[PDB]
């Protein structure tokens, strides 16, 4: 039972160049299919199940049961609420369902911070899969989503390319994208896009992520640890080198995911948009890990602001935002894991955003004052842009040093 699947080979999803040979052959019939407006549902299900299983059949291949459990568990609570929301709509039934849907994820995250081991509920894609599930409970709550097949739901939820850690997606647009197969040239354009993406991914993940991550980072950490203190010039090195490695590996992955998704005929959400040339903290979050970023924006932040408006709990328009920023970014930190440095990374980006949002209000009223004063509006050239970039780039790189937990190694290994 547990025995056979540990005797089946492990394929790290987008792990090497060779992975793309197998997946390529695999997807080829699906793609050719899309040219004749046909899909092959059973074949699609088989090939999805294979690559998910192969991603999960490590030395700890037990997680396939954890996935099996999870799939069943979600079917219960999604249908539990679907059947319920037909007739009655209540605040507290909603919360309980929402909690129960995120409950397996909470337990996975809470487990190493209580025993120092993994939950048996844990499987690779869990932290990203939960968004797809919760999303539906949220969308059904607001009555923007009503009818859907168990198939439609399961397709969307365990979509293979974006499974391991891929772009988060929402049901309504995924389903609508899957419904209508794109015309011959529009579809051929995707194939062009996919090779472009794959080749670029190769450069990022297999070359640059390798240069930063495994050639430059390990001696710089050895340097900074043997130096000691609260900070040092090698620790400034680790900060920049790690940040780039984190970028190239994750953005490289994301392109692979995007490309493979394209060969399946659906264009999944994008994750990065030159995030370093961002001049602003607000702009950075419109450019970095966008699928996640935008998810928290609509399903955590916007929904918190709405409930704080509902009671008008806070004095003014500015404290309600600033609280919600800090809460939203803290929950995001929590989602990464319950360690000091993840929560630290969270509150950092919160105060980071409030500082930013405050200056935007202030800068607006300096221009307002200047207009009445008769002066020219505050300078907006290339040097000002360059300055903004310098601020945020360094803010953001510093945040990644917190996020790496190298600071925990530098300070607390005692």
Q: Where are the domains of the chain?
A: 4-181, 182-272, 275-414
CA separation for the pair 38, 186 (Å, rounded): 16
CA 52 to chain centre: 18
Tokens of 281: 């903290």
Contact between 168 and 129 under an 8 Å Cβ cutoff? The reply is no
Q: Which of 281, 218, 212 is nearest to 248 (CA)?
A: 212
**DSSP assignment string, 313-332:** -SSSHHHHHHHHHHHHHHHH
Q: Which of 186, 129, 182, 130 lies closest to 160, judged by CA?
A: 129
CA-CA distance, 414 to 411, in Å (whole number)? 7
- What is the distance between the alpha carbons of residues 163 and 51, in angstroms, rounded to a whole number? 10
Round to whole Å and give the CA distance between 266 and 182.
9
346, 333 in Cβ contact below 8 A?
A: yes
CB neighbours of 110 closer than 8 A, spacing ≥ 6?
119, 338
Among 210, 189, 240, 227, CA closest to 16:
210
Classify the C-alpha dihedral 343-345-351-354 as positive or negative: negative
Structure tokens at 77: 């609570």
Contacts of residue 224, defined as CB under 8 A and 6 or more positions apart, other chains included, come to 232, 234, 235, 237, 238, 406, 410
The residues, ordered by sequence, that sit 6+ positions from 160 with a Cβ below 8 Å of its Cβ are 47, 48, 51, 52, 260, 264
Report the C-alpha gap between 21 and 157 in whole angstroms.
25
Q: Are 8 and 245 in contact, with CB atoms under 8 Å apart?
A: no
C-alpha dihedral over 320, 326, 329, 333, to 10 degrees?
-150
Instruction: Name 246's Cβ contacts closer than 8 Å, sequence gap at least 6.
Output: 400, 403, 404
- The overall longest dimension of the chain from CA atoms, in Å, is 80
Count each helix (H run) and each strand (E run) in the chain, helices first. 18, 0
Q: Please, where are the H alpha helices in 181-339?
A: 184-201, 209-210, 217-227, 233-263, 281-284, 290-296, 302-311, 317-336
Resolution given for this structure, in angstroms: 3.3
* Two tokens, residue 25: 């052959």
Cα–Cα dist 37/220, whole Å: 54
Sign of the torsion formed by the C-alpha atoms of 388, 393, 399 and 401: negative
Please report how many Cα atoms fall inside a 13 Å half-sphere around the Cα of residue 25, on the Cβ side.
Answer: 5
The pair of structure tokens assigned to 76 is 């219960």
Catalytic residue IDs: 336
Q: What is the DSSP letter of 183?
A: P
| CA within 13 Å, CB half, 354 | 18
Residues 6+ apart with CB under 8 A from 188: none
Q: What is the DSSP letter of 171?
A: H
Dihedrals φ, ψ of 369, to 5°?
A: -65, -45
Residue (of 161, 156, 167, 170) closest to 75 by Cα position: 156
Per-residue burial over 326-337, b if 16 or more Cβ lie within 10 Å, else e, is bbbbbebbebeb
With DSSP H G I counted as helix, E B as strand and the rest as coil, what are the percentages for the chain, rounded to 5?
Answer: 75, 0, 25
- Among 284, 198, 205, 188, which Cα is nearest to 251's? 205
**Distance (Å, whole) CA 5 – CA 59:** 9
Give every CB contact of residue 384 below 8 A, 6+ residues apart in sequence. none
Q: Residue holding tokens 């699609």?
A: 44
CB contact at 8 A, 64 and 5: yes
């Amino acid at each position: 039972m547990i025995d056979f699947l540990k005797q089946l080979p492990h394929l790290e999803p987008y792990g090497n160049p060779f992975y793309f040979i197998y997946l390529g052959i695999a997807l080829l019939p699906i793609f050719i299919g899309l040219f004749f407006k046909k899909r092959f549902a059973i074949y699609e299900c088989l090939v999805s199940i294979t690559f998910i299983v192969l991603a999960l059949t490590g030395t700890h291949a037990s997680q396939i049961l954890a996935l099996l459990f999870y799939i069943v568990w979600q079917i219960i609570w999604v249908y539990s609420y679907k059947r319920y929301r037909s007739q009655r709509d209540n605040k507290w039934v909603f919360y309980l369902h929402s909690f129960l849907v995120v409950l397996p994820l909470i337990l996975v995250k809470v487990e190493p911070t209580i025993n120092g081991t993994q939950s048996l509920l844990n499987f690779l894609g869990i932290s990203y899969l939960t968004f797809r599930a919760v999303g539906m409970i949220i969308e059904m709550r607001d009555g923007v989503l009503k009818e859907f097949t168990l198939g439609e739901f399961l397709r969307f939820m365990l979509f293979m390319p974006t499974f391991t850690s891929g772009p988060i997606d929402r049901f309504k647009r995924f389903n609508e994208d899957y419904q209508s197969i794109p015309n011959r040239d529009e579809l051929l354009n995707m194939l062009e896009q996919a090779v472009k993406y794959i080749m670029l991914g190769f450069l990022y993940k297999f070359v640059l992520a390798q240069i930063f991550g495994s050639m430059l980072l390990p001696p710089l950490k050895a340097q900074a640890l043997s130096q000691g203190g609260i900070f040092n010039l090698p620790t400034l090195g680790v900060m920049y080198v790690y940040g780039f490695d984190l970028f190239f590996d994750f953005a490289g992955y994301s392109m692979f995911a995007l490309a493979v998704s394209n060969l399946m005929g659906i264009k999944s959400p994008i994750n990065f948009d030159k995030p370093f040339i961002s001049r602003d903290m607000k702009e950075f979050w419109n450019r970095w890990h966008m699928s996640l970023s935008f998810w928290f924006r609509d399903f955590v932040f916007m929904r918190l602001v709405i409930v704080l408006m509902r009671n008008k709990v806070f004095k003014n328009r500015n404290t309600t935002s600033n609280v919600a920023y800090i809460i939203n970014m803290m929950v995001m930190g929590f989602w990464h894991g319950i360690t000091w440095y993840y929560i630290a990374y969270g509150i950092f980006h919160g105060i980071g955003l409030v500082i930013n949002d405050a200056w935007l209000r202030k800068k607006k009223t300096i221009n307002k004052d200047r207009k009445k004063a008769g002066l020219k509006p505050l300078p907006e050239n290339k040097w000002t842009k360059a300055l903004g970039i310098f601020i945020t780039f360094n803010t953001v790189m510093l945040s990644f040093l917190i996020f790496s937990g190298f600071l925990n190694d530098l300070w607390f290994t005692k």
